[PDB]
Design a protein around this ligand. Structure first.
Ligand SMILES: OC[C@H]1O[C@@H](O)[C@H](O)[C@@H](O)[C@@H]1O
Ligand SMILES: [Ca+2]
Length: 364
């Protein structure tokens, strides 16, 4: 029970307001870990991508020619540290950062367009909450983009979004101005193709494939009887006995027990570039893993993360039982987190980042 591996992933145990890491949950046992990505670095990368685009642009990106680069921001999960730090990244990059990641918290910024200085204004930063309470709702993004165009019109010079889902949702707007620069995050399949079409201007890969392998590989190492650095290194930062290794670069953060993949920008200049050859068939005995997903209709998890898991799982001889919640209530997941005695290891993607206790309670 409490002696088995527990790997949190994609939603780090943490306080949804202050973002401080929940080390109580992380210190569940000596076989507990988190797998994710360097979210803060990812945030600055999204910002840098936007600054580089503006820098290479002519003064035509200033549509109304008022000398101000106006933008609208799609805020996602305000209880998710990885999401908010993207709002922080782009705001810092553009000079609109005031210390808060909340909607309506922005000052006048500054950026270079065609070797000239420009004022920057966040016309509106809004949380795209669905009428059913669902966060980062894509239909709400379409709705908001429609109103924004009607309200601000020629003032909007670009669109920014915490993820691809909402960004691709903006593009659904019937009145979306042809060619309006817009940026997302995740490098979902549809988003990358959109970059190739010259619609979506750019997005960011968080190396989801590296993350998926890392979850399985850590469990693999632990069930093979590894301890210490071997657990977080073998098949991850160095080759294991089988010879397998995650190709993308990965860091281990000891203080928070986290394996973090890095990020890379995706633009018109490199979209064609976007499975791991460094992972091939394992001979180790098969093991049973119960893996949860906080929301079955989550675009990133449904379209990118889960397929990755189901691809690499048999290669590492991990028989994966997948259960999925609704994104609203932790009970939608916790209800399916049962028969824990019939499993060798566990992977948890929580609805709320502060719900660590509820999962470790069941494992007693
Ligand atoms: O937890 C779900 C979230 O994970 C993040 O890594 C993605 O950027 C979001 O698009 C997604 O909604
Ligand atoms: Ca303008």
């Amino acid at each position: 029970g409490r002696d088995k591996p527990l790997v949190f992933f994609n939603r780090q145990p943490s306080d949804p307001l202050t973002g401080k890491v929940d080390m109580a949950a992380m210190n569940w046992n000596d076989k507990t870990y988190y797998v994710g990505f360097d979210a803060k670095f990812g945030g600055s990368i999204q910002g840098k991508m936007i600054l580089d685009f503006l820098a290479s642009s002519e003064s035509s990106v200033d549509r109304n020619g008022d000398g101000i680069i106006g933008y609208v921001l799609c805020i996602g999960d305000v209880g998710h540290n990885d999401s908010k730090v993207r709002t922080e990244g782009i705001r810092r990059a553009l000079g609109t950062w005031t210390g808060s990641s909340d909607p309506g918290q922005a000052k006048e910024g500054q950026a270079v367009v065609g070797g000239k200085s420009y004022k920057v204004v966040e016309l509106e930063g809004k949380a795209m909450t669905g009428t059913d309470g669902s966060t980062a709702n894509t239909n709400s993004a379409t709705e908001s983009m429609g109103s924004w165009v009607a309200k601000f019109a020629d003032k909007i010079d670009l669109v920014i979004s915490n993820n691809d889902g909402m960004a691709m949702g903006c593009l659904q707007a019937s009145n979306y101005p042809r060619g309006l620069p817009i940026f997302g995050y995740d490098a979902n399949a549809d988003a990358v193709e959109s970059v190739g079409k010259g619609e979506l201007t750019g997005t960011v890969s968080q190396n989801v494939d590296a993350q998926a392998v890392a979850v399985l590989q850590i469990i693999r190492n632990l069930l093979d009887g590894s301890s210490g650095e071997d657990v977080v290194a073998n098949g991850i930062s160095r080759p294991d006995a089988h010879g397998n290794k995650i190709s993308a670069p990965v860091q281990y953060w000891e203080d928070v027990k986290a394996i973090m993949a890095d990020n890379s920008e995706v633009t018109s200049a490199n979209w064609k570039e976007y499975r791991d050859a460094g992972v091939r068939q394992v001979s180790a005995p098969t093991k049973k893993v119960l893996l949860t997903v906080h929301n079955a209709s989550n675009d990133f998890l449904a379209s990118a993360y889960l397929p990755a898991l189901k691809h690499y799982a048999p290669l590492l001889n991990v028989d994966l039982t997948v259960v999925q919640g609704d994104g609203q209530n932790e009970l939608s997941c916790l209800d399916k987190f049962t028969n824990l005695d019939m499993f060798d290891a566990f992977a948890v993607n929580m609805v709320k980042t502060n719900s660590g206790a509820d999962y470790t309670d069941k494992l007693k």
